[PDB]
Amino acid sequence: MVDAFLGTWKLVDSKNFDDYMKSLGVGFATRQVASMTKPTTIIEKNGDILTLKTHSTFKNTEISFKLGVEFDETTADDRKVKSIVTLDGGKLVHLQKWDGQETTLVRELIDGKLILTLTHGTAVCTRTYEKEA
Ligand SMILES: CC(C)Cc1ccc([C@@H](C)C(=O)O)cc1
C-alpha cells in the first residue's frame, strides 16, 4: 500500500545518474557536485497532501501534491516543469513535462528497498534507497 513509501530514505547505490543528468543538459561542474553526495528523501502525507523532500549538499528541494492533480515544479537543476504524481499498481510515478519533452521518476519497493528509476528518452538511471530506522 502507498503507506510503504512513507518515511526517510538514504541513497545506497546509483547507476547511470551522470548519464541521466547529461541527458537533461546539466553541466559537468553541476553533475560532479550532484554525484558526490548521498541524498536523503523524506516522503510524508497529511490528509490527501503528499510531500517529498530531498536533502543533499547539491540542493534541498520540497514538493507537495495530491495524487493525480497536476502541479508546477521547479526541479533541482532549475527546470520549470508541469508535474503529476500517480500510483500505477505498486509504482509511485512522478511525471515531469516541459517544452515538448518529459521524464519519469518512478519509485517501487523491492525487498524493502526503494528503487528510483529515472527515464529521459534512452537515459535510464537506477537510484537505490534504504529506509532509515
Ligand atoms: C537532473 C537531476 C539533478 C534531477 C534530480 C533527480 C534525482 C534526485 C534525487 C532523488 C536523487 O536520487 O539524487 C534529485 C534531482
131 in a structural domain: no
**Closest C-alpha to ligand 1, atom 11:** 39
d(CA 107, ligand 1 centre) in Å:
13
Of 10, 82, 77, the C-alpha closest to 39 is 10
130 in a structural domain: no
The set of cell numbers assigned to 97 is: 513535462
Contact in structure between 124 and 117 (CB atoms under 8 Å)? yes
Does the beta carbon of 123 sit less than 6 angstroms from any atom of ligand 1? no
29 in a structural domain: yes
Separation of alpha carbons 78 and 75, rounded Å: 5
55 in a structural domain: yes
Q: Check the annotation: does 40 bind a ligand.
A: no
If one counts the domains in the chain, the total is: 1
CATH number of the domain to which 54 belongs:
2.40.128.20
Does the beta carbon of 81 sit less than 6 angstroms from any atom of ligand 1? no
The set of cell numbers assigned to 65 is: 501534491
Q: What residue numbers bound the domain in which 30 lies?
A: 7-125
99 in a structural domain: yes
Sign, CA dihedral 91-43-69-72, equals: negative
